[PDB]
Design a protein around this ligand. Structure first.
Ligand SMILES: [Ca+2]
Ligand SMILES: [Ca+2]
Ligand SMILES: [Ca+2]
Ligand SMILES: [Ca+2]
Ligand SMILES: [Ca+2]
Lengths: 152, 167
């Protein structure tokens, strides 16, 4: 737990969820309480990474998969370059990309494809922040899914 | 006494020997997918046109964009076939590619011309260059009619008339 905190009451405790609630408010639990919060009882959760590399013999390398709209998606081969590949492995913390591959030679695609024509200056933080055609509507074939490798 | 079936045209190239590949089937002209395409796959098409051998193969619709429906997809060819029809194909109308990715060839007989004097690759007052088999060369000064000068200017488009410069 991060040391820096604002002393504020713990509203609820002992939250128990069924299978597949849309939101926490569907999970039954104990009644609301305004009790003072001990530092240990506060919860910090770290969701998984937004982007992940799949089907690569090395764990760090593979096809580029992005969690968008609740589902994992890939990136098309259009206008893909080495400088674009710098951003993706900057997220992972891996070393700079040694080479970029295209036309799904690395593996056949999966999931609904989200991004296309990705245009990254090379110093941008995230591909989501990068300017590119968003929210699908890319109609790229799954044989056009992209993949890269980067230094460990 | 038959006009035979199917024709092979090279469009948008500036010459008969270089152009985006278009194949005639039925009453429509269609393009070839760029996937599984290489210079070995381009030897047959350059031979059937009579131009000769291929020096490059272009993909990703760099040469141009084709509007016609794709006739053949995923061609693997030995490179010694008389016509593209003997090369292996997935099947007629098996369009899995798209107009975003298109295939073209550059044969050997395609030629181009330009004048370059200095600090400017295109300048209509300078030495003449010819382009054969991907190489740049000039023509001899000896035995050139003034009419030949005129056609040079007309081809590039500097003026209706030109005069030989000995210097
Ligand atoms: Ca492509
Ligand atoms: Ca780019
Ligand atoms: Ca392709
Ligand atoms: Ca082939
Ligand atoms: Ca295909």
């Amino acid at each position: 737990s991060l040391d820096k905190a604002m002393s504020i009451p713990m509203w609820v405790d002992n939250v128990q969820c069924p299978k597949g609630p849309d939101t926490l408010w569907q999970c039954p639990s104990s009644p609301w309480e305004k009790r003072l919060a001990s530092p240990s009882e506060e919860t910090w959760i770290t969701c998984d990474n937004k982007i992940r590399l799949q089907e690569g013999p090395t764990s760090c390398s593979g096809r580029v998969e992005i969690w968008h709209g609740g589902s994992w998606g890939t990136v098309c081969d259009d206008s893909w370059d080495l400088d674009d590949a710098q951003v993706v492995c900057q997220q992972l913390g891996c070393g700079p990309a040694l080479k970029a591959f295209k036309e799904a030679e690395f593996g056949q695609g999966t999931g609904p494809i989200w991004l296309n024509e990705v245009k990254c200056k090379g110093n941008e933080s995230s591909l989501w922040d990068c300017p590119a055609r968003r929210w699908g509507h890319s109609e790229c074939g799954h044989k056009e899914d992209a993949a890269v490798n980067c230094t460990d | 006494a038959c006009i035979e079936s199917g024709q092979l045209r090279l469009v948008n190239g500036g010459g008969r020997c270089a152009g985006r590949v278009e194949i005639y089937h039925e009453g429509s002209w269609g393009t070839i997918c760029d996937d599984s395409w290489d210079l070995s796959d381009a030897h047959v098409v350059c031979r059937q046109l009579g131009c000769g051998e291929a020096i490059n193969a272009t993909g990703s619709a760099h040469f141009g964009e084709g509007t016609g429906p794709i006739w053949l997809d995923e061609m693997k060819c030995n490179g010694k076939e008389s016509r593209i029809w003997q090369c292996h194909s997935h099947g007629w109308g098996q369009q899995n590619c798209r107009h975003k990715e298109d295939a073209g060839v550059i044969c050997s007989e395609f030629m181009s011309l330009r004048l370059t004097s200095e600090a400017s690759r295109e300048a209509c007052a300078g030495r003449l260059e010819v382009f054969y088999n991907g190489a740049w060369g000039t023509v001899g000064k000896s035995s050139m009619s003034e009419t030949t000068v005129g056609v040079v200017c007309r081809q590039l488009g500097c003026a209706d008339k030109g005069k030989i410069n000995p210097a």
